Tab-separated table of C-alpha atoms and ligand atoms in Angstrom:
chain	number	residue	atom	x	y	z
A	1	UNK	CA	-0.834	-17.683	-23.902
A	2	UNK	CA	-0.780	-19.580	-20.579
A	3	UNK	CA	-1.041	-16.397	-18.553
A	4	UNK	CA	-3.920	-14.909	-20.488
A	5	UNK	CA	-7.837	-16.663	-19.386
A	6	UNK	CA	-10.115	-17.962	-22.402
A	7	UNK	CA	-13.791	-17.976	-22.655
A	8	UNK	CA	-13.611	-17.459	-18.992
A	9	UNK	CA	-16.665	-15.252	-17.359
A	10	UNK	CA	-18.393	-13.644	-14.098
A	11	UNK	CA	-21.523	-11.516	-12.899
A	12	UNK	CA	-21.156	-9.101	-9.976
A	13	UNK	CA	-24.386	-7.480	-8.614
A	14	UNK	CA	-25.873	-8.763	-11.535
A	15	UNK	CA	-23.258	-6.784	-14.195
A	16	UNK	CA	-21.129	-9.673	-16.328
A	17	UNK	CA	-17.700	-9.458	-16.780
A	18	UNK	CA	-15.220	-11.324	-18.471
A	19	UNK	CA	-12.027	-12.677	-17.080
A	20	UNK	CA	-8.982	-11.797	-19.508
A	21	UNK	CA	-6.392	-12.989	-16.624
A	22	UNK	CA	-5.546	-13.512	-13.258
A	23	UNK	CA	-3.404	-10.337	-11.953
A	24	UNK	CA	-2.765	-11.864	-8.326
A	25	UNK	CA	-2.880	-13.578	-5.605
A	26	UNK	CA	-2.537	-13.508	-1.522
A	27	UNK	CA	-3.960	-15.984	1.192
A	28	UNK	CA	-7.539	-17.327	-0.085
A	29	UNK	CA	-7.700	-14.549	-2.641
A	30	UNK	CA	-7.305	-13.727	-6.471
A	31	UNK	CA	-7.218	-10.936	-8.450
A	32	UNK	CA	-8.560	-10.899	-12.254
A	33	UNK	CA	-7.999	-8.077	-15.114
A	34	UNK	CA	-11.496	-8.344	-16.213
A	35	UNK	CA	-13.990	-6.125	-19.116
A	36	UNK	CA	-17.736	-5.093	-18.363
A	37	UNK	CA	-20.253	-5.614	-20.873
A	38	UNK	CA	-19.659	-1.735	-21.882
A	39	UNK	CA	-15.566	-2.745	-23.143
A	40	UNK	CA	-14.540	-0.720	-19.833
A	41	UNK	CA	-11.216	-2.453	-18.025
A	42	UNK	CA	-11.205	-3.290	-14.304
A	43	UNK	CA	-9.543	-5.748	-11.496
A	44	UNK	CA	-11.860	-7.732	-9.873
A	45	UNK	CA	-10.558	-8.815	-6.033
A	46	UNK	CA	-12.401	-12.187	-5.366
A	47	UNK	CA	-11.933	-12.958	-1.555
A	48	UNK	CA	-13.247	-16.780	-0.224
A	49	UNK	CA	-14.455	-16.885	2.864
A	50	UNK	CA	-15.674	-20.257	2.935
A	51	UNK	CA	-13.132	-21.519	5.945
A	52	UNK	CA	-13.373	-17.543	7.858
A	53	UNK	CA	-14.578	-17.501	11.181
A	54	UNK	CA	-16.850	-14.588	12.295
A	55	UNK	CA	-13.944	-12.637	13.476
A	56	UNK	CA	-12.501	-12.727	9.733
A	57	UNK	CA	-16.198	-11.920	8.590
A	58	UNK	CA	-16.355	-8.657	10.200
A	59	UNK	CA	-12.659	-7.943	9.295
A	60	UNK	CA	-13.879	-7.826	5.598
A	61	UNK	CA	-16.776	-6.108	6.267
A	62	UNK	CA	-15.144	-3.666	7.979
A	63	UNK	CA	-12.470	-3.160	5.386
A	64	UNK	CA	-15.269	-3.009	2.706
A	65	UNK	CA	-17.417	-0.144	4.906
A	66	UNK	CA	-14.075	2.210	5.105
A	67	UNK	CA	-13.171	1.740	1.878
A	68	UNK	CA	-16.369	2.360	0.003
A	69	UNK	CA	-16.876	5.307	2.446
A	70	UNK	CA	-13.094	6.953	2.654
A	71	UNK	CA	-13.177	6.791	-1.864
A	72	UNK	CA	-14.752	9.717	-1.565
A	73	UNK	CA	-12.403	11.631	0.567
A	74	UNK	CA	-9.147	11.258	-1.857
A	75	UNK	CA	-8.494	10.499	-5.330
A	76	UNK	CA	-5.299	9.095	-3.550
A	77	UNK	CA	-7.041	5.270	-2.584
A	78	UNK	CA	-8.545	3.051	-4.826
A	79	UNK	CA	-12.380	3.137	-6.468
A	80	UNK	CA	-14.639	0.518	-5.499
A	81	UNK	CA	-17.607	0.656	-8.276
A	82	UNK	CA	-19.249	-2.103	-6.817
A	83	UNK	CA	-19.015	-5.449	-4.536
A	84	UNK	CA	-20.960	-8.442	-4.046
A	85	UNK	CA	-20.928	-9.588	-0.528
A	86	UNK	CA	-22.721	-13.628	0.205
A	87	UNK	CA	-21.386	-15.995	3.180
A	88	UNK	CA	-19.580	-18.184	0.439
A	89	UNK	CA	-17.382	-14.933	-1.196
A	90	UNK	CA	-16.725	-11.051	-1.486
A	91	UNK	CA	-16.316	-9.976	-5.207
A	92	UNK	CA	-15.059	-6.426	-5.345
A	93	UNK	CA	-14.884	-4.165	-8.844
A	94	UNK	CA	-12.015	-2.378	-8.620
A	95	UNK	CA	-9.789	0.443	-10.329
A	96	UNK	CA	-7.324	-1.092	-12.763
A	97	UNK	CA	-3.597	-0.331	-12.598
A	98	UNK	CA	-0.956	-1.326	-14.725
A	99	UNK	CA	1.875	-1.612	-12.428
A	100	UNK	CA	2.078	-1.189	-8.313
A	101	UNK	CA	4.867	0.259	-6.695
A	102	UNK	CA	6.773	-2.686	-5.623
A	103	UNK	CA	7.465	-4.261	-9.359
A	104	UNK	CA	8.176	-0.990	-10.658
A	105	UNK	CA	10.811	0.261	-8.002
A	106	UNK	CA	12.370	-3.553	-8.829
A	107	UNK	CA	12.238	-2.508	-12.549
A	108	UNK	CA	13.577	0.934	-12.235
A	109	UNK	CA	17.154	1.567	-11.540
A	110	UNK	CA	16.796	4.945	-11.143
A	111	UNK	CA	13.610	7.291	-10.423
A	112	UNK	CA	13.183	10.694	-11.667
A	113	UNK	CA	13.231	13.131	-8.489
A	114	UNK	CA	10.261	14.701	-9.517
A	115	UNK	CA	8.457	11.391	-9.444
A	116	UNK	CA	9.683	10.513	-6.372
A	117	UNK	CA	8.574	13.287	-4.769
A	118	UNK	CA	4.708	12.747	-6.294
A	119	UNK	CA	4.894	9.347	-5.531
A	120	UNK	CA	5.703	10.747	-1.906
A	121	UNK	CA	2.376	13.284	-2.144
A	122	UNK	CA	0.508	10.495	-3.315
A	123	UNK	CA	1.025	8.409	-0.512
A	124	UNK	CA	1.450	11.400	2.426
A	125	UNK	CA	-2.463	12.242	1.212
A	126	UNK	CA	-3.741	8.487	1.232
A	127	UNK	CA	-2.348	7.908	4.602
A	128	UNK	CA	-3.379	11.204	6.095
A	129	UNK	CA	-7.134	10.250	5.151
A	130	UNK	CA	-7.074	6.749	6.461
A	131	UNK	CA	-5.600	8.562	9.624
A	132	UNK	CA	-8.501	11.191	9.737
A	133	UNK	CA	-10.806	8.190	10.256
A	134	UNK	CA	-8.762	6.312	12.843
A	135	UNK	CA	-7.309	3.828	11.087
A	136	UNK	CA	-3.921	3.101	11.127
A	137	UNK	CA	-2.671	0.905	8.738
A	138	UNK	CA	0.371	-1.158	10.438
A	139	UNK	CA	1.727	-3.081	7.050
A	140	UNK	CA	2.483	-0.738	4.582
A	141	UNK	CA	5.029	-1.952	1.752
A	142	UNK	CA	5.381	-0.735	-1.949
A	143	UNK	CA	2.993	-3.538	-2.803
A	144	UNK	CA	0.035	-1.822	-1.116
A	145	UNK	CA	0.637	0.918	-3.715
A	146	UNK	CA	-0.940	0.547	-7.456
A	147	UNK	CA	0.288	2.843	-10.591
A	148	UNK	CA	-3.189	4.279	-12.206
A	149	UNK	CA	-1.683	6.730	-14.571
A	150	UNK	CA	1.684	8.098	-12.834
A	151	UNK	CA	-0.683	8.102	-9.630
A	152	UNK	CA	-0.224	5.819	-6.483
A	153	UNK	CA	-3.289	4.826	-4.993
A	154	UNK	CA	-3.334	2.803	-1.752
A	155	UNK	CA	-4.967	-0.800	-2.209
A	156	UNK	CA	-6.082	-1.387	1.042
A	157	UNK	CA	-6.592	-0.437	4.914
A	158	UNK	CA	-5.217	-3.103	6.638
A	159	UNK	CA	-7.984	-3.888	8.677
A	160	UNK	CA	-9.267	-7.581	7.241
A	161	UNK	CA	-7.335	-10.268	8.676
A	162	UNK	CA	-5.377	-12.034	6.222
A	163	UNK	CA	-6.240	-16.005	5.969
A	164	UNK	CA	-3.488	-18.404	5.715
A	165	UNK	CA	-3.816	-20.819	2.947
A	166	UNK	CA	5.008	-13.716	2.683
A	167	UNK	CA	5.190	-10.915	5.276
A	168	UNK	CA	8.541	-8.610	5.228
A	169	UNK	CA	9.836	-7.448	8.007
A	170	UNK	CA	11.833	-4.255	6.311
A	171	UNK	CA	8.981	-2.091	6.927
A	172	UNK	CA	8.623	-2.529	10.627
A	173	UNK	CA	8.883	-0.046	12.823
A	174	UNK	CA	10.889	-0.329	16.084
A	175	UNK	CA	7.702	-0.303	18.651
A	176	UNK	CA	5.765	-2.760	16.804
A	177	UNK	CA	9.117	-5.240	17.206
A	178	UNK	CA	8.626	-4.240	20.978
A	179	UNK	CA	5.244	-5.483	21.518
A	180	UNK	CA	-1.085	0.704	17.106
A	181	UNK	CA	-0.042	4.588	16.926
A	182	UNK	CA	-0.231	6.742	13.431
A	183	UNK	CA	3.435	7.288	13.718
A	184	UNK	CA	4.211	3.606	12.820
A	185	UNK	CA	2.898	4.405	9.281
A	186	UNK	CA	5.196	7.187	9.106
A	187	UNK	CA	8.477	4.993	10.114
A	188	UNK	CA	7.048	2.593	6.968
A	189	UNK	CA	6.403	5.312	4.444
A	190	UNK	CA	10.032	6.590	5.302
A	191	UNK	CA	11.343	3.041	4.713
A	192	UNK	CA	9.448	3.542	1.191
A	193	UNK	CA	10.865	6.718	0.444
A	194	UNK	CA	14.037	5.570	1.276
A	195	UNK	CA	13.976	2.723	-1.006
A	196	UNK	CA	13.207	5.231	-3.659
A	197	UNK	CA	16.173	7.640	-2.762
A	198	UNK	CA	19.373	4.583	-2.067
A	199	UNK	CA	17.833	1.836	-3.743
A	200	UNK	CA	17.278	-0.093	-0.713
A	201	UNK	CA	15.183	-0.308	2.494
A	202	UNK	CA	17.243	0.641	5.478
A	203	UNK	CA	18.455	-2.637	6.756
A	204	UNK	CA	18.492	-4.476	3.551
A	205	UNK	CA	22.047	-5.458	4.146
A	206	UNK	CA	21.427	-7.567	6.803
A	207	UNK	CA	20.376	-10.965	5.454
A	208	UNK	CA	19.662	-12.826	9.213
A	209	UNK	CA	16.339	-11.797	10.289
A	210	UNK	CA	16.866	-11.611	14.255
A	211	UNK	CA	20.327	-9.293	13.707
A	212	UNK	CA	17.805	-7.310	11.317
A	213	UNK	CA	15.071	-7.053	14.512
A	214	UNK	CA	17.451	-6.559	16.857
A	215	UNK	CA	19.240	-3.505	14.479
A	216	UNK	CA	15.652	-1.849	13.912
A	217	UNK	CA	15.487	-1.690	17.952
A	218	UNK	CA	19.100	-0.839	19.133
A	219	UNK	CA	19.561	2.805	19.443
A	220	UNK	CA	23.381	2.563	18.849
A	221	UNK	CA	22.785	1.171	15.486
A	222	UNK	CA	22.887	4.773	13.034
A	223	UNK	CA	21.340	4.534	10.207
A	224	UNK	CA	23.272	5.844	7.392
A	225	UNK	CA	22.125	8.499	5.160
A	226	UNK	CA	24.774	9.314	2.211
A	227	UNK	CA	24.596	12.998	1.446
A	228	UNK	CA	22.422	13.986	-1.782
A	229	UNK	CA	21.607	17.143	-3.357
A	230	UNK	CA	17.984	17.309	-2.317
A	231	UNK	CA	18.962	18.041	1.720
A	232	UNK	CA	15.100	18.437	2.383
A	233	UNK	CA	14.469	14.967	1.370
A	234	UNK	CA	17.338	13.918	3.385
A	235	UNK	CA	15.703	15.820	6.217
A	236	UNK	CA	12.586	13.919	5.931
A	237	UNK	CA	14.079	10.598	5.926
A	238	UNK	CA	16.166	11.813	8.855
A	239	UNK	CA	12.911	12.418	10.511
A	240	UNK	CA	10.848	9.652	9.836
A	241	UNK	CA	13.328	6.938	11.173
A	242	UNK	CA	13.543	8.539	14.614
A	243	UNK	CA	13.127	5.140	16.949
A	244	UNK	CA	11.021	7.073	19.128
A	245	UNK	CA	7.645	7.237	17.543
A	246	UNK	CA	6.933	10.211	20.279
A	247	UNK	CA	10.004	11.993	18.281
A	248	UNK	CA	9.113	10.963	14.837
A	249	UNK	CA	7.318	13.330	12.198
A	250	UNK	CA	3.704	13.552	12.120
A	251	UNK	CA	1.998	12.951	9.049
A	252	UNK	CA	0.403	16.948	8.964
A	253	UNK	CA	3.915	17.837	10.089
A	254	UNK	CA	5.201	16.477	6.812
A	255	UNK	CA	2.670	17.587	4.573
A	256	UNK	CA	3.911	21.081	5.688
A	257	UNK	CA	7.594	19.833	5.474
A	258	UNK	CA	9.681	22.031	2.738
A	259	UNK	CA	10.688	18.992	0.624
A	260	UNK	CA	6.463	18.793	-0.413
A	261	UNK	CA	6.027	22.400	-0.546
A	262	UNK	CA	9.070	24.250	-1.514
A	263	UNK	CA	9.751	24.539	-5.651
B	301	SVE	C1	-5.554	-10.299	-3.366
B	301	SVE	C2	-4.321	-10.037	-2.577
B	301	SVE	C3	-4.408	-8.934	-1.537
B	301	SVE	C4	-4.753	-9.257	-0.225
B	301	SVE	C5	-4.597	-8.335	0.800
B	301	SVE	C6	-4.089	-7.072	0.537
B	301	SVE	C7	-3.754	-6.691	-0.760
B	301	SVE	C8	-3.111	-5.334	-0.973
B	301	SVE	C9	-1.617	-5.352	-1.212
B	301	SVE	C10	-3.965	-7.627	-1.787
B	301	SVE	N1	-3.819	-7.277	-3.161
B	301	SVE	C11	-4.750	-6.621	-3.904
B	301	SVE	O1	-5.835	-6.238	-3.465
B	301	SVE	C12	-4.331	-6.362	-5.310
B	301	SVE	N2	-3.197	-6.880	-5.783
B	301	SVE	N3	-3.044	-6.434	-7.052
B	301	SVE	C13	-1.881	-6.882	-7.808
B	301	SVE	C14	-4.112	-5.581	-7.412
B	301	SVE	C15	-4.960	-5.523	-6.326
B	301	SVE	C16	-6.243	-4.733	-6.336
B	301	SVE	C17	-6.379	-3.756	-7.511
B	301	SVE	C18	-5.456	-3.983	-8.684
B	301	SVE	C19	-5.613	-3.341	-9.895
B	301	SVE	N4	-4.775	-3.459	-10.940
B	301	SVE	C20	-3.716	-4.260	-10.749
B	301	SVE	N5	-2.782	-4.446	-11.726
B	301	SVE	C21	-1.445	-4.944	-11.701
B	301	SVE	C22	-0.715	-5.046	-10.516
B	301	SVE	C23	0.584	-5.521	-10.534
B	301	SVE	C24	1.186	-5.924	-11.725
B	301	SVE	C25	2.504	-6.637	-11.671
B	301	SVE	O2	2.835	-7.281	-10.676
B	301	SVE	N6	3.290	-6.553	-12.755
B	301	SVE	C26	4.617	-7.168	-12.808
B	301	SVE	C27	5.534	-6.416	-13.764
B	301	SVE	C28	6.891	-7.124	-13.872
B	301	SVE	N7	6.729	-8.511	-14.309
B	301	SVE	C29	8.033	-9.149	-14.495
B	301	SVE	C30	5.930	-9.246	-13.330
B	301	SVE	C31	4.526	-8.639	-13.193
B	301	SVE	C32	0.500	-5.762	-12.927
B	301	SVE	C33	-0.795	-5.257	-12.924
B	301	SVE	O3	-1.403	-4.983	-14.144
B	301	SVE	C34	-1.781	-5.939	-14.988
B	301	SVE	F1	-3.088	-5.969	-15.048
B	301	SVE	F2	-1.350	-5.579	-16.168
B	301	SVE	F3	-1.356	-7.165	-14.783
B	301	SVE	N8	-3.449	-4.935	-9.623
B	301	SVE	C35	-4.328	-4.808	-8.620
């Protein structure tokens, strides 16, 4: 009714689609579940970038370059069909999902271990490839995650700069708190994982934000990790919530890891 768009309509590169709703939202941009003229369903990410300074400009462009480039290299991130780039917007036709990881682990009490551990595969591969090309995304969350038929595909790169018109600190890992390296992804991811495995990031618990920056830091702080009967996945948590990003697992070392390989 109110959340569903009527009679509403847009052309990218030319190509109409029409808007059946709006699917987001984030700084100065929206995201609509639209149809092509062909019936075929897809989200288009409309980006204003009417108050961006040139900075901002080539943060998007930039973004928009690796991603249209890195599609190619793993199934793992998001298509881009198409985008529409003018000094007044950026219109991007993307791959539709119909969940992303951050509602569904909120709507699911309990995940399959199986799942889990796909999810896990899903987001090891997307990660390694953005890595491969230097990029290091800094602000991964389940949200950056979308659902395209049991697979997680990574939404973005973090590279544009986000325009104010909101950020959790859960995810952060200890050297970025201190101040970049591909080992603060992997202290993120493991933060994801172990959402998925206890039902809760690992300093959830502590409601004042400070105390919580302050716990991510101090070395004397142990994280706890109740025993379960996967002891490999315990193992990897273990090892990607080392403090010291120089003793943290690598992202190849993981992909090797027994928990990903071993039946
Ligand atoms: C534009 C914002 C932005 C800026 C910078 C960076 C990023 C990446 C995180 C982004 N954000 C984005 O770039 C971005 N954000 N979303 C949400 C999507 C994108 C791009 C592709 C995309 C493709 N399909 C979807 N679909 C859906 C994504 C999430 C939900 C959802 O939240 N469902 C909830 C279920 C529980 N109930 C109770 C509440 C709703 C439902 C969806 O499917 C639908 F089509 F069916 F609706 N979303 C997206």
């Amino acid at each position: 009714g109110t959340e569903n768009l009527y009679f509403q309509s847009m052309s990218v590169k030319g190509r109409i689609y029409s808007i059946l709703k709006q699917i987001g939202s984030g700084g100065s941009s929206k995201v609509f579940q639209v149809l092509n003229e062909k019936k075929q369903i897809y989200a288009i990410k409309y980006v204003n970038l009417e108050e961006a300074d040139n900075q901002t400009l080539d943060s998007y462009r930039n973004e928009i370059a690796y991603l249209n480039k890195l599609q190619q290299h793993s199934d793992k991130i998001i298509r881009l069909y198409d985008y529409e780039i003018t000094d007044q917007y950026i219109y991007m036709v993307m791959e539709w999902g119909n969940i992303d990881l951050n509602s569904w682990l909120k709507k699911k009490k309990s995940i399959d271990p199986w799942e889990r551990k796909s999810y896990w595969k899903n987001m090891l591969e997307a990660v390694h490839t953005i890595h491969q090309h230097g990029i290091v995304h800094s602000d991964l969350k389940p949200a950056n995650f979308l659902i395209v038929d049991g697979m997680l595909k990574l939404i973005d790169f973090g590279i544009a700069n986000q325009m104010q018109p909101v950020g959790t600190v859960n995810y952060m890992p200890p050297e970025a708190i201190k101040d970049i390296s591909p080992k603060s992804d992997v202290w993120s991811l493991g933060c994801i994982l172990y959402y998925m495995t206890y039902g809760k990031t690992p300093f959830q618990q502590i409601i004042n934000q400070i105390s919580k920056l302050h716990a991510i830091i101090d070395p004397n702080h142990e994280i706890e990790f109740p025993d379960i009967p996967e002891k490999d996945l315990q193992d990897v948590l273990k090892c990607c919530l080392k403090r010291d990003p120089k003793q943290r697992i690598s992202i190849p070392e993981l992909l090797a890891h027994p928990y990903v390989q071993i039946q």
